[PDB]
């Protein structure tokens, strides 16, 4: 459950947040495969409540109504089509599995659902699965309200309703079997793994009992005996009774300390400095590298209300954001996920964004297609961070240096730092308020290297900055603090 099951030499996944299946299928073929991306995390593919006030928020997709593969992203045919086309060019699909709960207990009964299925939350009837009142934790939860009230009590965090969402009785074999039937449907279609949403609110042993029921991966695309990649969403910043290590038996875990700390560092908040990153990783109290799924932001905390609050860097802070993603992709810690977002009309009142609910770009609720602009970014207000040259080229850097040790660290005791990955890559950051002009040991073989942040290697030409590594492995780097992107990265495949 710890292995991503990506193709040889692909080392990252991209969250195509709220994309339609047909657009993800195209993206696999036209971009993700040639540029070396490992896989795609997709939005939950099962039927969910259609919420009309507010109008179609992104988080309606975390309120299941059934396990039919029928959403605003597309139907089962389009989902199957996407998974087949991506697998056929060596790009995996990871599914956001919403299995802690069904929808909110106060949702009005009827057929306001993305496939028209009937459901009745008050009477706990989800006949499209089917679930009944016997399948929920109403009798198990011990709080007066029936909701989660105290996070110092690890039991109610698991058995009570998360903000009123109907909590499934995951100890029951029938419920485990309905969930496993859903995930096995997806596995046989060809998905490579799962993000387990809201894992903190599930018992580790109930998760294990569901995973015990899963098939091996589809043997047309994966070696025999391959197991689904499992990464569990657990927000563990310390100070709570539930620890993310309690979930290591089931798979990896999201390391939410990673982006919160990196954001504060690169923003230079709370006395932090980039030079402090010399011991980045478990030296900062993170989970072991082989159990971590890391990221700068995710779809949730990029809206500023989440784990890290305002320190999380997002596409809205593009200049610092590119630096943070670059550091993450160059550093060996963890398995890396890159965010790909859409724009919304952000409107902060008291440090919190009243429009943080707004869903994907839409015409009257129908999601807009991803259009590709001439400069290979995206239109229709899809941000497509994963197509930004500075980010895509660092996805490739991480492929090229895969396996090589963190080495040749430099820092100025402030915010100018550099390091190499074996003899395959070197990266240099200037986050101080003065220029960085210095000769550094790069570890790389002698020659001329294209800086892949400012440009690209095309044929035997560079379109941006060129770095000259001498026979001793040393190279001069000049980075103004005014530079558009104040970092430089070179690697074995950017050498002329």
């Amino acid at each position: 459950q710890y292995s991503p099951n990506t193709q040889q030499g692909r080392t990252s996944i991209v969250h195509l947040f709220e994309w339609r299946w047909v657009d993800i299928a195209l993206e696999c073929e036209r971009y993700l495969a040639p540029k070396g991306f490992g896989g795609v995390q997709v939005s939950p593919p099962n039927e969910n409540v259609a919420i009309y006030n507010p109008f179609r928020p992104w988080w309606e997709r975390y309120q299941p109504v059934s396990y039919k593969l029928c959403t605003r992203s597309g139907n089962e045919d389009e989902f199957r089509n996407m998974v087949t086309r991506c697998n056929n060019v060596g790009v995996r699909i990871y599914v956001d599995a919403v299995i802690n709960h069904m929808c909110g207990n106060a949702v009005s009964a009827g057929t306001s659902s993305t496939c028209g299925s009937y459901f009745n939350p008050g009477s706990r009837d989800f006949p499209a699965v089917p679930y009944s009142g016997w399948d929920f934790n109403d009798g198990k939860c011990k709080t007066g309200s029936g909701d989660i009230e105290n996070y110092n009590d690890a039991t109610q965090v698991r058995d009570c309703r998360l903000t009123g969402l109907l909590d499934l009785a995951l100890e029951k074999d029938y419920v485990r079997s309905k969930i496993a039937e859903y995930m096995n449907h997806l596995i046989d279609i060809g998905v490579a793994g799962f993000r387990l949403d809201a894992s903190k609110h599930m018992w580790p042993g109930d998760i294990k009992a569901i995973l015990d029921k899963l098939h091996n991966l589809n043997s047309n695309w994966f070696p025999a005996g391959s197991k689904p990649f499992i990464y569990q969403e657990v927000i563990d910043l310390g100070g709570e009774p539930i620890k993310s290590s309690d979930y290591f038996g089931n798979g990896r875990v999201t390391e939410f300390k990673y982006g919160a700390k990196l954001g504060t560092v690169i923003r230079k908040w709370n006395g932090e400095k980039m030079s402090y990153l010399k011991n980045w990783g478990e030296g900062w109290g993170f989970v072991p590298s082989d159990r971590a799924l890391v990221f700068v932001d995710n779809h949730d905390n990029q809206r500023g209300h989440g784990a890290g609050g305002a320190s999380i860097l997002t596409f809205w802070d593009a200049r610092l954001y590119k630096m943070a993603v670059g550091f993450m992709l160059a550093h060996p810690y963890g398995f890396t996920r890159v965010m790909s977002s859409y724009r919304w009309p952000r409107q902060f009142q008291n440090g919190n964004d009243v429009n943080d609910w707004v869903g994907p770009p839409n015409n009257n609720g129908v999601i807009k297609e991803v259009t590709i602009n001439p400069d290979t970014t995206c239109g229709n207000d899809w941000v497509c961070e994963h197509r930004w040259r500075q980010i895509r080229n660092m996805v490739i850097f991480r492929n090229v240096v895969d396996g090589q040790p963190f080495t040749n660290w430099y820092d100025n005791g402030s915010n100018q730092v550099a390091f190499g990955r074996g003899n395959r890559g070197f990266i240099v950051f200037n986050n101080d308020d003065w220029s960085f002009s210095l000769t550094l040991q790069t570890g790389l073989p002698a020659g001329t290297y294209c800086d892949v942040i400012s440009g690209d290697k095309i044929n035997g030409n560079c379109t941006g900055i060129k770095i000259y590594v001498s026979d001793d492995g040393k190279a001069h780097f000049s980075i103004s603090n005014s530079a558009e992107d104040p970092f430089i990265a070179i690697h074995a495949e950017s050498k002329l």
Partner: peptide
């Protein structure tokens, strides 16, 4: 809480 504090909406 969860989902960018969805319940406040």
């Amino acid at each position: 809480x969860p989902y960018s504090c969805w319940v406040r909406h």
